Write a protein that binds this ligand. Structure first.
Ligand SMILES: *[C@@H]1O[C@H](CO)[C@@H](O[C@@H]2O[C@H](CO)[C@@H](O)[C@H](O)[C@H]2NC(C)=O)[C@H](O)[C@H]1NC(C)=O
Ligand SMILES: *[C@@H]1O[C@H](CO)[C@@H](O[C@@H]2O[C@H](CO)[C@@H](O)[C@H](O)[C@H]2NC(C)=O)[C@H](O)[C@H]1NC(C)=O
Ligand SMILES: *[C@@H]1O[C@H](CO)[C@@H](O[C@@H]2O[C@H](CO)[C@@H](O)[C@H](O)[C@H]2NC(C)=O)[C@H](O)[C@H]1NC(C)=O
Ligand SMILES: *[C@@H]1O[C@H](CO)[C@@H](O[C@@H]2O[C@H](CO)[C@@H](O)[C@H](O)[C@H]2NC(C)=O)[C@H](O)[C@H]1NC(C)=O
Ligand SMILES: *[C@@H]1O[C@H](CO)[C@@H](O[C@@H]2O[C@H](CO)[C@@H](O)[C@H](O)[C@H]2NC(C)=O)[C@H](O)[C@H]1NC(C)=O
Ligand SMILES: *[C@@H]1O[C@H](CO)[C@@H](O[C@@H]2O[C@H](CO)[C@@H](O)[C@H](O)[C@H]2NC(C)=O)[C@H](O)[C@H]1NC(C)=O
Ligand SMILES: CC(=O)NC[C@H](O)[C@H](O)[C@@H]1O[C@@](O)(C(=O)O)C[C@H](O)[C@H]1NC(C)=O
Ligand SMILES: CC(=O)NC[C@H](O)[C@H](O)[C@@H]1O[C@@](O)(C(=O)O)C[C@H](O)[C@H]1NC(C)=O
Ligand SMILES: CC(=O)NC[C@H](O)[C@H](O)[C@@H]1O[C@@](O)(C(=O)O)C[C@H](O)[C@H]1NC(C)=O
Ligand SMILES: CC(=O)NC[C@H](O)[C@H](O)[C@@H]1O[C@@](O)(C(=O)O)C[C@H](O)[C@H]1NC(C)=O
Ligand SMILES: CC(=O)NC[C@H](O)[C@H](O)[C@@H]1O[C@@](O)(C(=O)O)C[C@H](O)[C@H]1NC(C)=O
Ligand SMILES: CC(=O)NC[C@H](O)[C@H](O)[C@@H]1O[C@@](O)(C(=O)O)C[C@H](O)[C@H]1NC(C)=O
Ligand SMILES: C[As](C)(=O)[O-]
Ligand SMILES: C[As](C)(=O)[O-]
Ligand SMILES: C[As](C)(=O)[O-]
Lengths: 149, 424, 149, 424, 149, 424
């Protein structure tokens, strides 16, 4: 119900970020549009996952120096070593994720201020992603100027 | 009118937990993958490595680069001569090529030896040169994993007590003899009324050779083999014997019959066994049965200063000529060694015997500025820490680790929705 | 003073999340109620600490393969090894903590929107946890409907 | 009216720092704890392990499972026969049971040996079988940490030069002799005017046995002990001697009096010492004082292909019968071995000697599908990386680590308040 | 443009947190003051970087036990070991940073509520750092009381 | 009027990425730095360590603390006596000081030996005591890296067969002889018509000494050196010989001329070589040429229970007196040892020979409650995990690691702006 939460859907139905509307003459039945051109997003998603590499290049560059002179493989040793290393990696993953998860959701919070500062304080922050606009002092191409839908 | 931006996912959207919230998305890209592996030889450090070689690595050779399996840039890093081998230079059989190998390098490539195969048809009473060959090259590889440098020591300090004695010759050995061992005889010893006096000799494994330092030395303590006492007595008297003690008098090698049985193949007549022991530097003593005497004269000088695992490379002829794999099995039965093997036969570009495509692409790793690991399975660069399969030892360097593909973690991509909180 | 900060208390006195009120006829002396039934909370606190295990099960599953053939213990070795491992663990702890600390405080921020969106924009976000309600257009069982206290 | 939700803590609330803010709470749950440890034997991999055993592990035994210390599922994994021991099968004393042990397994359990204790009252001139026993089983355990498989080699290739010679017998050895060593005598040697000719013999440690490969062999180089020269001379002449050299003629074992003193206990008369050396495969030579000759005839064949530390299990009798702890101290003085010991005596379910409760619960680990480590302190599963106390070596597997309880970090619980920022 | 974003400047020009103003009689050309006495900040920046040590003292205290009996240095070994350890450290760094970055920017969000709660709901949260004050019902030393500039 | 707080940075502001957003700032402080290193000796655990010493560590010395290089608190941790050395107590030359060293400590400091330098002018037919010295102290250091404790064994169990024999004396050895080895002679042996009977002897390396347990023993297998046979024959007959076998009869040391050449320096006359072998506990046998006999009588007793690398400290005299560096090179050529060396000469406070400033500050580490590592490069505390340079082995403890300063990560400071999101 607007940016801190994620809902689901069945059968067909696409997924993502869209545009919705609530009440009216008391009481309403809601109405959801079909996404805005929300292109600032896809520029950033493209930015972000292109940054991860920094840490990924870091993890890639670290291979420890070893020397066995022995003719037969040390397989438990090999795989303890491999298990430790995949272990360390799991952590790293978990952090890139949070590093996006936080930074993605920190820029979904750097788009919904663009929306709360154009028509303002008409907007009236119902927090983020969601707002309170009265059909009294803001209307129809005042609402195609602001939301972009 | 309350106007939101609702986030929502499908049965095609999957969550991804972070430490600091989680994430939604339909697809993922793996964080890392495996690192390709290349068969053959290569080196992790280009300015500390040395090859010892032969015609196939010789640039002086009147036929280079058709006669060579390496480029020139690489050929400059070898100590080769056309027709040389480490073995021959340990013995210097009559009319062979006698190159004084000496290099210093941590990574060491050995790509020679074919120039003494059975084809060399060296006789000189050789019991089973292919045996001699294997035991030789093993002590070499045994000592070169732990050494930085190596040099042929082409003349050892020696002395005989017997003064009547004279030096050997064989129809079988081109009518002269080995450079090493040295062979001394007594004309007068007559099994049938004379048996002469026991000869003594001594010899010194030096503590250095020119700029090269000797912690350890590879020699041959050579003795004679006879079918039996009766066989021998037709020359000598009682048992045959030939013995090597150190300065303290502890016995290291040799063949004293008076305590162990005879073992000379039937009617083979006299032979020679040339097993290779590793000895410290120092003065070693020799007692022999009166008429004959044998003496070690060369050696291979090594330090204990350290080495990487070595890379021994398959050095046989083409199909037409009689080779052997004595340095393969020597590399196999010895620690820290690494064999390099062709899947096909050798097919030369100048000769039949010189210029193999498979070899050139095998040894092309030698080569690069960016090899980071070097295993018995071949060699890698530093793309990732993993390999699809195990890198087989012996190996050294930043060696990767085989993990199963299903364990390599992944990272979100395509459409991505955050998450945070129980959302309730 | 309302959700980004934590205060203390002496002697007796319970601790937690409560309900408070400010001024009046100019000027007021404050008034703090005795907790709401804030049960969405305790469902989530119960949810969250039941999630940690994922990482805890991960840390538990990683024990490296070793082989000593030696009859006498390698005790400094043992304890260097044990110290490294407790070390690695300290980090992990520190991250679960932040992973709650962030996610707990991200759902205390997923309760105070429920409060800012029922009576709205009567609420008037004095940020989170705190709000501005005038005794002019919203009164007494308009205030037992919204705050639930 | 400004209407907030204030957060607040007591002198009973404690903060918890995170990397990403911190946290408040009155109580905590530890993140991890220790992992229980179970005394006894077990294995980390059920399909690569082999036990060698006796009646106590034999299912053919007419009294199973009352005569057994293991379940059947487990008993199937042993190579046992009722009354066998590895030692007896190395010697095959007259009228003993002669089981050809052979299995292959990385983890190896050894649970036998009691069937040659002093109680066996085997004589045959045994100097101190309990000694022989210990030195035997040590070389066995010494060689089984580094081997995958093991087989009894129940007949070695051998030959004597002397043709007049004949084979031994003792009132003391049930009027025959050992299967190994083999004993050869000279009727004519008469200390008092005849002293006969020196006998030679040779023997071959094979490079394989059936499907089993031999890198290393455990034998007994057996010799005679006499109180003194005078004692001996009443049989032989001069010193006694009996000597083992290899193919090169270096001496490995034996008892040559002409260089070392006599050591036979007073008036004990003749005895035999049977110390066990490990030898490579190959042909070994023998020289003895003329009248008598001794020859090794069996062996234990091992590979060098690798092994886990082994598990040696206490195999004594019940109180009533005369046992010994010769395999305990053998396990103790040998690397990579592990002893398993009862705290009580053995109290059998079928016999007094067969079916101990303590043992059954000891060996019940053998047992499980989920043992992950196996230390001299017993064995664990994989709950946590820690143990309350050290897991005592020898050990192998994902072995835990003793940390102090006070260092195991903890995680918040009960009432929890976040925190973030200086809040000022 | 107000607390989620950072701008740049050329030539001379100082950097930091300042004070700005927007429009007017339609339309305006903006006006930026010269920092407030924002001293709560520098107390906290001083607090925070003095906390890091906790983790830094932790990293410092962990040196593993080793024993070589060998007379010649194991240099690749030494430096694999040194590279692993600097590696581990890089991570730690990355986390202190986020631990500030989050906690600094969590207290820049614990100053701009002090500003949104003094003159309220005159402020009208244009989110954080930024707000909507009309020159109708709040003027000039109502604006030197609140912003402190 | 929209009224913001804009954040902004310069060309003097730099970003810093975090996992959870990033950061701005003009300056940074490094997270860690290097840890200082101190030359000399020290110990990581004060209650498990032992020094063995001399006047320079003796507090009974009538001149302490001017005669000492350590404080008292430290001097209490040594087993010293003024004028002692481990070597002398192995031999007890006539009129020397004979201190029974015995301590037990994992970390071990050795700070003695000067009390037998050439200056001691000990003769007694010493071939090259400085040689004897080096080979001695090596086996000592060789055995003390792997031992917890050490004690002088000041009397070994011994016996001679020959009953006519008598004990030695030399003008050269203050008209008596060594405490060890023991020297036995035959009056009657007359090269010129009498040559007497071969003497036997035996001796026992005990399995313990008082509270001290003996796994390994450091002895001298001493023999005589002659220029040649002719030289020797003026005493004995045929070759000289002197030989040491074990209980089995395998030969360990000695000097048997009948298999190896003579090596006595020209006209040097008779000498003695005293090389030190490490032997297990047990009874060892001796055969000598009839007129003379030599016998080991003392030893150094060590356990196998484990030890840290040891710390050997430079023990020479002042310039004026004749020293040697025989324990330096002994420490150098031996594993797990560590030398401590002055950069200047020794300049004493009581004597010229006792009380060096450099030494006192060198050995002052011994000293502290807080040394955490101890390398051949000196010793550190536990400030950081890094060192500017490599800590040179041998080393033990929480040893730091040389990293380049440019790799040590840093942390923001001064003015700091956060960041988060693409901000777009
Ligand atoms: C859930 O929603 C997503 C998008 O909202 C769906 O993904 C689309 O899939 C179509 C094909 O069916 C592709 O052509 C598009 O590229 C996708 N769109 C986006 C925006 O990624 C997905 O199929 C949906 N899942 C279900 C089960 O309906
Ligand atoms: C950090 O905490 C979050 C939230 O508590 C964890 O997210 C849960 O992850 C599991 C999968 O392990 C999901 O099934 C749950 O639905 C998630 N819950 C929520 C509220 O998001 C996450 O696992 C933690 N991070 C790590 C690395 O363990
Ligand atoms: C601080 O506050 C907490 C709760 O706000 C107190 O904890 C309560 O303790 C009582 C017993 O005294 C328990 O029966 C309750 O279960 C607890 N309540 C909660 C909500 O957890 C705590 O005792 C207080 N500390 C002090 C020193 O007053
Ligand atoms: C992350 O940063 C926070 C805030 O700077 C640190 O929290 C401090 O922790 C110490 C205990 O080490 C407390 O005494 C302080 O009161 C805390 N300050 C604040 C403002 O919360 C925390 O230590 C850091 N995380 C880690 C793992 O070190
Ligand atoms: C960017 O801005 C900062 C401050 O806003 C400048 O730093 C000042 O530098 C002066 C000297 O030029 C110092 O005396 C002050 O202590 C600094 N002020 C602060 C607040 O730190 C910095 O020089 C600017 N960079 C450029 C290129 O103009
Ligand atoms: C966490 O994610 C942030 C944001 O995606 C990364 O920040 C980028 O860092 C690079 C330097 O590596 C900068 O050049 C970019 O400008 C940064 N982008 C943003 C949007 O801040 C950061 O690298 C990640 N953390 C780590 C430790 O890699
Ligand atoms: C010392 C010397 O002249 N060595 C010749 C060396 O074997 C040389 O590689 C080859 O010599 C040959 O006699 C041979 O067939 O072995 C003729 C070959 O053409 C020649 N090949 C080359 C490439 O030199
Ligand atoms: C090992 C040994 O006893 N070798 C004897 C050697 O074959 C023999 O004396 C040699 O016999 C020869 O026919 C030969 O060429 O082999 C002629 C050699 O001159 C002769 N050599 C000597 C030293 O007598
Ligand atoms: C080869 C053979 O018959 N071995 C017998 C084996 O010792 C057997 O376990 C026991 O044999 C006995 O003579 C003995 O007391 O040792 C009688 C025991 O009842 C018998 N016990 C069992 C369990 O078989
Ligand atoms: C080691 C040794 O010299 N053993 C001699 C052996 O005891 C002796 O010759 C044997 O004496 C016996 O009384 C006995 O049974 O021991 C009768 C044996 O037939 C006899 N054996 C032989 C081979 O002579
Ligand atoms: C056993 C005994 O009396 N040893 C004397 C020990 O060497 C002593 O340190 C020094 O003895 C001297 O004869 C010497 O010059 O060596 C005289 C020195 O003054 C004396 N020095 C000291 C510090 O005792
Ligand atoms: C090693 C050896 O043969 N030493 C002989 C020894 O020097 C010689 O017999 C001794 O000669 C002496 O002049 C001396 O003091 O050296 C007088 C000694 O009494 C004499 N010693 C003996 C045991 O005869
Ligand atoms: C092999 As080439 C010709 O030397
Ligand atoms: C011990 As059973 C009876 O074999
Ligand atoms: C050196 As002091 C005097 O003993």
């Amino acid at each position: 119900f607007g940016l801190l939460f994620v809902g689901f859907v069945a059968g067909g139905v696409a997924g993502g970020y869209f545009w919705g509307r609530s009440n009216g003459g008391g009481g309403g039945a809601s109405v959801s549009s079909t996404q805005a051109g929300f292109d600032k997003i896809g520029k950033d998603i493209q930015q972000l996952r292109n940054d991860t590499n920094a840490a990924i290049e870091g993890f890639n560059g670290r291979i420890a120096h070893d020397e066995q002179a022995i003719k037969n493989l040390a397989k438990e040793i090999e795989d303890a070593r491999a298990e430790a290393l995949v272990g360390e990696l799991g952590i790293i993953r978990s952090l890139i994720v949070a590093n996006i998860s936080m930074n993605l959701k920190e820029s979904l919070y750097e788009l919904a201020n663009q929306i709360t500062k154009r028509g303002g304080g008409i907007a009236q922050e119902a927090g983020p992603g969601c707002w309170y606009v009265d059909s009294e002092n803001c209307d129809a191409s005042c609402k195609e100027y602001i939301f972009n839908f | 009118e309350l106007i939101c931006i609702v986030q929502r996912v499908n049965e095609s959207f999957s969550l991804h937990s972070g430490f600091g919230g989680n994430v939604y998305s339909m697809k993922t890209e793996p964080m890392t993958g495996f690192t390709n592996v290349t068969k053959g030889a290569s080196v992790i450090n280009q300015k500390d490595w040395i090859g010892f070689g032969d015609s196939r690595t010789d640039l002086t050779n009147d036929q280079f680069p058709a006669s060579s399996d390496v480029p020139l840039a690489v050929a400059k890093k070898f100590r080769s001569l056309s027709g040389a081998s480490l073995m021959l230079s340990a013995f210097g059989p009559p009319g062979k090529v006698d190159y004084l190998y000496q290099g210093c390098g941590k990574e060491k490539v050995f790509y020679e030896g074919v120039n003494w195969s059975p084809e060399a048809g060296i006789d000189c009473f050789g019991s089973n040169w292919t045996q001699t060959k294997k035991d030789f090259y093993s002590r070499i590889y045994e000592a070169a994993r732990s050494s930085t440098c190596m040099t042929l020591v082409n003349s050892l300090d020696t002395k005989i007590s017997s003064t009547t004695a004279t030096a050997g010759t064989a129809s079988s050995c081109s009518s002269s003899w080995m450079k090493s061992p040295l062979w001394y005889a007594e004309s007068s010893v007559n099994p049938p009324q004379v048996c002469g006096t026991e000869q003594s000799a001594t010899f010194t494994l030096p503590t250095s050779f020119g700029i090269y330092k000797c912690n350890k030395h590879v020699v041959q303590l050579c003795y004679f083999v006879y079918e039996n006492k009766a066989k021998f007595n037709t020359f000598g008297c009682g048992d045959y014997y030939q013995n090597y003690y150190d300065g303290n008098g502890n016995l290291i090698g040799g063949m004293d019959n008076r305590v162990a049985a005879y073992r000379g193949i039937a009617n083979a007549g006299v032979k020679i066994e040339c097993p290779s022991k590793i000895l410290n530097p120092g003065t070693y003593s020799i007692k022999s049965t009166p008429r004959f005497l044998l003496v070690p004269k060369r050696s291979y000088c090594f330090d204990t200063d350290g080495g990487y695992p070595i890379q021994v490379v398959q050095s046989e002829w083409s199909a037409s000529r009689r080779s052997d794999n004595a340095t393969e099995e020597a590399c196999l039965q010895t620690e820290g060694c690494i064999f390099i093997k062709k899947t096909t036969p050798y097919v030369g570009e100048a000769d039949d015997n010189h210029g193999d495509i498979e070899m050139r692409q095998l040894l092309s790793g030698l080569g690069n500025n960016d090899t980071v690991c070097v295993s018995q399975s071949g060699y890698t660069k530093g793309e990732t820490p993993f390999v699809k399969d195990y890198l087989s030892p012996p190996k050294y360097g930043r060696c990767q680790l085989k993990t199963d593909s299903g364990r390599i973690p992944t990272l979100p991509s395509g459409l991505i929705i955050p998450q945070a909180g129980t959302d309730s």
